Amino acid sequence: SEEQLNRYEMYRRSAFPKAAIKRLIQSITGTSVSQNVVIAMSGISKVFVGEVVEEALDVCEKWGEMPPLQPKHMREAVRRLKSKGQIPNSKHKKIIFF
Amino acid sequence: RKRLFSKELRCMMYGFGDDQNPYTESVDILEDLVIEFITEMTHKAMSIGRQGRVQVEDIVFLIRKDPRKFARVKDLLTMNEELKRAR
């Protein structure tokens, strides 16, 4: 239609800027990264945003609300993703044997 | 901290079905989630492989388990190589 073609345009053309993530990663490493790191790390974070919004619209469709996304559907989105191990936290030393 | 992903993330939520005009608080939650994800991946990458260096190989091992993200990384790298060859 005429909205699906505009939505497909924003699904492909949108990206995080490489001039800021290279500034963001290098503040964590200390020295330097490469261009093929920033190209991949800018691409995984678009999949991760698409992992949340496609699942936060499943929270909103499950409850009785409309397309505008309140933060109620967004804290619930991170809760359901973390219970399936999708959201990694490297500060919680987990233990499976008890 | 200011918001470094305020205008970029509003195009992306529209790209996955949200609205043309999302809420500022929802955009803020998404920006915080993206920063936390990038930080976690960078620490694990520094630990795995060459200590103190984050490489594409380390990032690929880290994302190997999740199918959607692994496929995207492989496609982007292959397309980048192809574009360099075309140039």
Partner: peptide, 26 residues
Amino acid sequence: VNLSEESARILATNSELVGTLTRSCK
């Protein structure tokens, strides 16, 4: 020179269509 000016035109239309009014929520 063609790659340098055309890169910012994919993002310039990404500030005219999406996000016209800024909302909030209780």
